[PDB]
Amino acid sequence: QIVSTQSPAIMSASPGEKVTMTCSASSSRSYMQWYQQKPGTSPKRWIYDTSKLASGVPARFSGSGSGTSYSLTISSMEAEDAATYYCHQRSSYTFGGGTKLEIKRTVAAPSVFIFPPSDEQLKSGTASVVCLLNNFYPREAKVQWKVDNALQSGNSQESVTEQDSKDSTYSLSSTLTLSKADYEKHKVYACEVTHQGLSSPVTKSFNR
Amino acid sequence: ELCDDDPPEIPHATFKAMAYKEGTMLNCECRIKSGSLYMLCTGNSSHSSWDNQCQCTSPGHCREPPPWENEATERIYHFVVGQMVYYQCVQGYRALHRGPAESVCKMTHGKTRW
Amino acid sequence: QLQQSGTVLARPGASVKMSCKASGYSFTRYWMHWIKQRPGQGLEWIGAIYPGNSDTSYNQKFEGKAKLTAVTSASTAYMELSSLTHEDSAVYYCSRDYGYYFDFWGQGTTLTVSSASTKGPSVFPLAPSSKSTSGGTAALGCLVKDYFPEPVTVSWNSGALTSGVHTFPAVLQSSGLYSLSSVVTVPSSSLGTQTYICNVNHKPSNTKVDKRVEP
Ligand SMILES: *[C@@H]1O[C@H](CO)[C@@H](O[C@@H]2O[C@H](CO)[C@@H](O[C@@H]3O[C@H](CO)[C@@H](O)[C@H](O)[C@@H]3O)[C@H](O)[C@H]2NC(C)=O)[C@H](O)[C@H]1NC(C)=O
């Protein structure tokens, strides 16, 4: 059974840059198709029969390859192109893993906020501590929790937005979830932030 | 641009296309697990060919594909708009129409017809 | 053209049958493909069916999980999905095959499989303070906790406020319920004058709360 593999998984491009993404077959193929997908919509035809563009596909896009190695190419990168591209073949109908293409822009340091658990939440018996990293680039950031200088693990979850439509930035929340018992058992709640745009690691904290 | 209509079944007549237009689909029926559904007539700027091969168990155009191990009846093709097939009289004798020219796909104001 | 059935909920072990109603073309003459997409991950081919003779073909991963059928008289393709697990929670697309490529797709069907029952969220304020200020800016928000299923909807000031709003993707908690935060950045000076309310709406549970956020 034929299996497609795409490289890279995620790549960034500044407007104007040439972008190249690779898809390789496990066994020889005659043609390669590519599909485009943006969040909240269906995949759309993009490139078929290796090099043939579908109706409405910009001239910036070209398709290349043969045998077991294929590629999609954007000659000049534009904002409209940020998407995931899946390679696909009509022999056995398997898809590649997809290449997510994003916008590269200059580094931006995250604004760092911390929120203590609301009074109302503490009645229900649970405490959520929220650390927010606002409007930064690139996506790569490390956030850690420390209660009374004890590094926490296993009890926090992170959420990251998609690239903003104007800023091209990312926002990130980290949430510390603990029982009212655990919460009251301690004093200092620290959010420790590591990012390219900072002289890492920066700590935002509060005493209970 | 695929003809969603079947060619007309005329009494004492057999219809065959000589050359299949680029985009035609031939379903593969007889069973053939692994993979391989239909065959697509397509190619690059300089060539034309059928894309896949079909197993079984229990100029600008493509040339008719060679018969595989098990295939029943007249083949159920999916023609494209502008494709033209030709009728031939086998043992049934009628030829009051001298010049033979019928059965072409056309996009008549939105719907395909023969 | 290609209209699929609405969002489904299911428990582990159950089955589910979703539909895909074709219109505006001969349902008989085209191959109909089904494609899975798990949250975050990529596309997976489930299988195909020719409604002219019900000739089906499957991906090896789904041989005994998916069943593909069609009712020519309805112009509708069906897919039944058996002994459902958490890994079946995805978005399912049906698409027509144009040989060259799949030329038309449905809007998709979101299957969620869980042993949780429908629950409206608790909405907690994320109150602005000295912590949660950065220079000229202050940040405030709403914690939308313990709900099932997706989606929730958050607006600020009945949709009057838009700039600076970030509403994070929901994370599935270990308890089986979802949670997310909605957050907006404002000038610190406008914290006294302007009033801030998040509008959390969860249609699956008919619940809706308006929470006022303040220092
Ligand atoms: C699309 O266009 C190409 C471009 O000319 C077509 O030409 C030739 O296709 C055949 C494949 O059937 C290739 O023949 C092979 O050539 C190699 C190298 O000489 C030889 O070692 C093999 O034994 C084989 O016969 C050939 O590469 C290719 N010609 C050129 C100049 O690239 C081609 O038929 C069309 N596409 C496909 C997928 O076949």
Tell me the strand percentage band of chain C: over 45%
What CATH first level of the largest domain in chain A would be assigned?
Mainly Beta
Give, in order, the helices and strands of chain C.
Answer: EEEEEEEEEEEEEEEEEEHEE
What form of chain A results from the Cα inertia axes?
Answer: elongated
Q: Could you say which structural class the secondary elements and strand pairing of chain C correspond to? A: mainly beta
Largest interface, counted by CB within 8 Å of the partner chain's CB: A-C, 48 and 47 residues
Q: Which shape of chain C, going by the Cα principal axes? A: elongated
Classify the fold: give the CATH topology of the largest domain in chain C. Immunoglobulin-like
Please, what is the oligomeric state?
Answer: heterotrimer
The CATH homologous superfamily of the largest domain in chain A corresponds to Immunoglobulins
**Spatial sequence of strands, sheet with the most strands of chain A:** 2-9-8-4-5-6
Number of helices of chain C: 1
Organism (chain B): Homo sapiens (Human)
Disulfide bonds (chain B): 3-105, 28-54, 30-56, 41-62
Function (chain B): Receptor for interleukin-2. The receptor is involved in the regulation of immune tolerance by controlling regulatory T cells (TREGs) activity. TREGs suppress the activation and expansion of autoreactive T-cells.
Domain Sushi (chain B): 1-58, 60-114
Structure in words:
The complex is a heterotrimer of chains A (208), B (114) and C (215). By secondary structure, chain A is mainly β. Chain A is built from two helices and 17 strands. Chain A has helices at residues 119-124, 180-184; strands at 4-7, 10-13, 19-29, 33-37, 44-48, 52-53, 61-74, 83-88, 99-103, 111-115, 126-136, 141-147, 150-152, 156-160, 170-179, 188-195, 202-207. In chain A, the strands form four sheets. In chain A, strands 2-9-8-4-5-6 form a six-stranded mixed β-sheet, with no helix packed on it. In chain A, a hairpin with a 3-residue loop joins strand 5 and strand 6 (52-53). The radius of gyration of chain A is 22 Å and the shape is elongated. Chain A starts with a strand and ends with a strand. With 114 residues, chain B is mainly β. In chain B, 0% of the residues lie in helices and 26% in strands. In chain B, strand 9 and strand 10 (111-113) form a beta hairpin. Chain B is globular and about 50 Å long. Chain C has one helix and 20 strands. Chain C has one helix spanning 190-193, and strands at 2-4, 8-10, 16-22, 32-37, 43-50, 55-58, 66-71, 76-81, 90-97, 102-105, 109-113, 122-126, 133-134, 137-147, 153-156, 165-167, 171-172, 178-187, 196-202, 207-213. In chain C, the strands form four sheets. In chain C, strands 2, 4, 5, 6, 9, 10 and 11 form a seven-stranded mixed β-sheet that branches. At the A-C interface, strand 4, strand 8, strand 10, helix 1 and strand 11 of A face strand 5, strand 10, strand 12, strand 13 and strand 14 of C. Residues 44, 46-47 of chain B line the site of a molecule of 3 linked components (NAG-NAG-BMA). Chain B: Receptor for interleukin-2. The receptor is involved in the regulation of immune tolerance by controlling regulatory T cells (TREGs) activity. TREGs suppress the activation and expansion of autoreactive T-cells. Chain B: This is Interleukin-2 receptor subunit alpha. Chain B: Glycans are attached at residue 44. Chain B: Residues 1-58, 60-114 form the Sushi domain.
